[model samples]
Structure formats: C-alpha cells, structure tokens
Target: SNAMIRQARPEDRFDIAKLVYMVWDDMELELVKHLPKDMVLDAIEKSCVDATYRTFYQHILVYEVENKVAGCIISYSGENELKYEKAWELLDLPEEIKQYGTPLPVKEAKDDEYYIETIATFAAYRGRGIATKLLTSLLESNTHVKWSLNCDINNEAALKLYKKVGFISDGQIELYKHMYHHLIV
Candidate 1:
C-alpha cells in the first residue's frame, strides 16, 4: 500500500488529536506527562477546530496509509506569526487545560524562514519514510529559502531524519536545562 498526503480537514480532529498527543509526548513531555490522555485529546480537538496555531490543524498535512491516518506534519509560514501573537487570549478553554501552557514552545521566526512546528508518525509506521515524504513535499513547494525546526538533542532518530532532509544544526539552546537543536532546512 502507498501513503497519501493531504491537507487536514475539520473532520480530521479525532485522528489529528491522537497524533498531536504523540508529538507532545515525544517533544514536550514536561507539559503533557501529568495530564490524562483523554483530556489532552479533547483539548487538541478544540484547538484544531479553532484553526489557530494553538493545535495548528490549519497547518497540518496528514499522511494516510491504506486509508488510515498514519502520521502528520504541522508547519506554517513566518508571515502568519502576528496572527498568533495573542492567540490564546481568544481561546475559550478549561482552566485545567490552560495549565498545559503553549501547545509547543515559541521560537521566533526569522524573516526569511518558515517553520516546521512538529512532525510525528505512529510507532508502527516508522521506518517507512512517511516523515521523509512529508518533509520533502513541504519543502519542494515552500516559498521560504530557509526552514526552521527544533528537536530535543537527545532524540537521535529525529536528528538523523532532519539531517537527511538537508537541515543543519545552527546550534543548541538550553531551554530550562534541556538541550534543543535548532535546525535550518
């Protein structure tokens, strides 16, 4: 079977929420580990419907394998940064959900760079080049000369994949004592 990639729809909230949880579990453990999965899922779906950078569904591209969503990649242009400057202020959210903080850490986007917010594939879908396909599809059509993304320095597999996709580490930043690689594609 082949994988098909497409823009995410409002109807994709359920699967999108699941993949968003996986991305959070892997990259932003500090914010989500203590929260219940169902709560996380509900919050994700809410923001997805909100169509803001909160959960970033508007920027997501899902890859389906045999008609099942197997992975997702979320990216957005730097041009839209201002739209989210006060995004959360308009979000009607549960107090406990607000405690989760920003869905992902905020990285200032340079004028010439677009950003890859996050990408994740289910464990069963790894090693099948789903991520490579997603990244390549985004890059090939992107308007930005440079692309930026962040990854935990400890995630070797992710580091390798980014490297394979032409992203080079500009340097490492110590955010709350955790090492993060800032890569440019």
Candidate 2:
C-alpha cells in the first residue's frame, strides 16, 4: 500500500485531536460565510474533543501517509447526534434534554445505517485522493442500509465529493446539519 488507512488506535488520539481542530478551523474560516473569526474559533475548540471521542466509537477513519496522519473522517452508522439533537430542540422537548440529551451520552449507531457525518483532509494533503479513499473504505466495510452525511449546500467541493461517492441528497432542512456543513436552503 502507498499508505495505510485504518481504524485509529488509542495512541492516535493526539494526532487525531489536532487534525479535527485544523480541519474545523480551516473550513470555518475558508468555507463558512460571514462567520466571525473569534466565534468560529471558539465553536471549533468547544466541539473538537467530544467530537473526537464520538468518532472513535463510530468508526472515525484516518489516513496515514509517510507515517503521519494526513486526513480524518468522523462518522457514525446510526443515531446521528446532530440530527437528533436538533429534532429534540425543535420539538421543544425540554431545556434539560435539549441542553443535554439524557444522562447517558449520545448513543452510537445501531447495526444498520451507514452514516458519515464529518470527513476532512489537510490542506497540504488535498488532491491526494485521501478523502475519497477513506470514505470508500467505510462504505465497503459497513455493509448497511445506507451511508449518509449532511454537507453545506454551498460547499461545492464537499457536495461534489459526496455526490462523486454516491451520497444522495435527502434535501431535508436539517438546521443543525446545515449549520455544521454551512448549508442553506
């Protein structure tokens, strides 16, 4: 193999953590329209750690090239938290639940769906085909009903990549999904 793509080991956490920040920081600045710089940074830092943990359990794929982590894809095959939380908030279930869903943490995916919520590649690693390869591995390994992720309506590259990988647009106005991927309308 030119480079190995695999499930990240526990030792991989530090590198993975940094990648998550870099990906979020870069994308928010470059792709998020009108996002204030400070707010963007804060949003990224607050969410990075928890997001990283979730990824480990949900098959967050990583790419190592030349012995360094060059890309990351944080995905779950079931009960997408962003989608579910937004739904709960919309329904106005309760402040406590909306603020924090149950005493238990966000549940992992069941044995059915194939969902890919976040995937990012380093700027230096762009055009190396790492992102596509990562997603392809997930799809191939997880033989499930469907693989899904919500990307911003405006992120042309992300949209194009998803389409290229055979991810159909549900076209639902998932506000949280839209917000995360910077999608609108």
Against the true structure, whose lDDT is highest? 1
Worst 10 residues of 2 by lDDT: 176-185
**True-vs-predicted CA distance for residue 12, candidate 2, Å:** 1.2
Error of 2 at 93 (Å): 28
How far off is residue 79 in model 2, in Å?
A: 2.5
* lDDT by residue for model 2 (13-121), tens: 5666566556545444332334444443333333333343344523567898888878887775455554542332233232432343321133323334555656777
Candidate 1 at residue 86, lDDT?
A: 42
- Model 1 vs truth, CA RMSD: 2.6
Candidate 1 residue spans exceeding 4 A from truth: 28-31, 79-85, 99-101, 108-111
Clashing pairs for predicted structure model 2, backbone only: 78-109, 152-183, 153-183
**Total backbone collisions, model 1:** 0
Q: CA lDDT of each candidate?
A: 0.75, 0.56
